[PDB]
From a paper:
Kinetoplastids are evolutionarily divergent eukaryotes that have an unconventional set of kinetochore proteins. In this study, we show that KKT2 and KKT3 are important for recruiting multiple kinetochore proteins, including KKT1, KKT4, KKT14, KKT22, and KKT23, while localization of KKT2 and KKT3 is independent from various kinetochore proteins.
Our analysis revealed the presence of two distinct zinc-binding domains: The N-terminal one (referred to as the CL domain for its key role in centromere localization; see below) consists of two β-sheets (where β-strands 1, 4, and 5 comprise the first β-sheet, and β-strands 2 and 3 comprise the second β-sheet) and one α-helix, while the C-terminal one consists of one β-sheet (comprising β-strands 6 and 7) and one α-helix. The CL domain coordinates two zinc ions and the C-terminal domain coordinates one zinc ion. The closest structural homologue of the BsKKT2 CL domain was the atypical C1 domain of the Vav1 protein (root mean square deviation [RMSD]: 2.7 Å across 52 Cα). More importantly, the CL domain does not have the HX12CX2CXnCX2CX4HX2CX7C motif that is present in all C1 domains. Our analysis revealed a highly conserved acidic patch centered around residue BsKKT2 D626.
Residue numbers in the entry: 570 to 668
The structure:
Amino acid sequence: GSSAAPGAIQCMNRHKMERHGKMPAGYKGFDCNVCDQPMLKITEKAYMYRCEKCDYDVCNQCAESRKFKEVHFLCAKCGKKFPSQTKLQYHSRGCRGPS
Ligand SMILES: [Cl-]
Ligand SMILES: [Zn+2]
Ligand SMILES: [Zn+2]
Ligand SMILES: [Zn+2]
């Protein structure tokens, strides 16, 4: 249950994103889903925002400047948007329609 206001820090499917300013153990990091910058360690200079339900990870620079991916991949069965074909493919394997 989350619908961001236009221009708020949101994921591609308009949910509010959680800021992660600390690192858990076993943290593998990610490549920013918007700019592709590697984010291997969370610090005060380089931190992340995440939407858990979308598996959407963005660096603080892209999130706060409202940068968006210029290519969107959509699931035909539920309409959900993804930043890559690989993430759409992982979703699609287990999707037969809206949850
Ligand atoms: Cl839209
Ligand atoms: Zn980024
Ligand atoms: Zn989301
Ligand atoms: Zn789907």
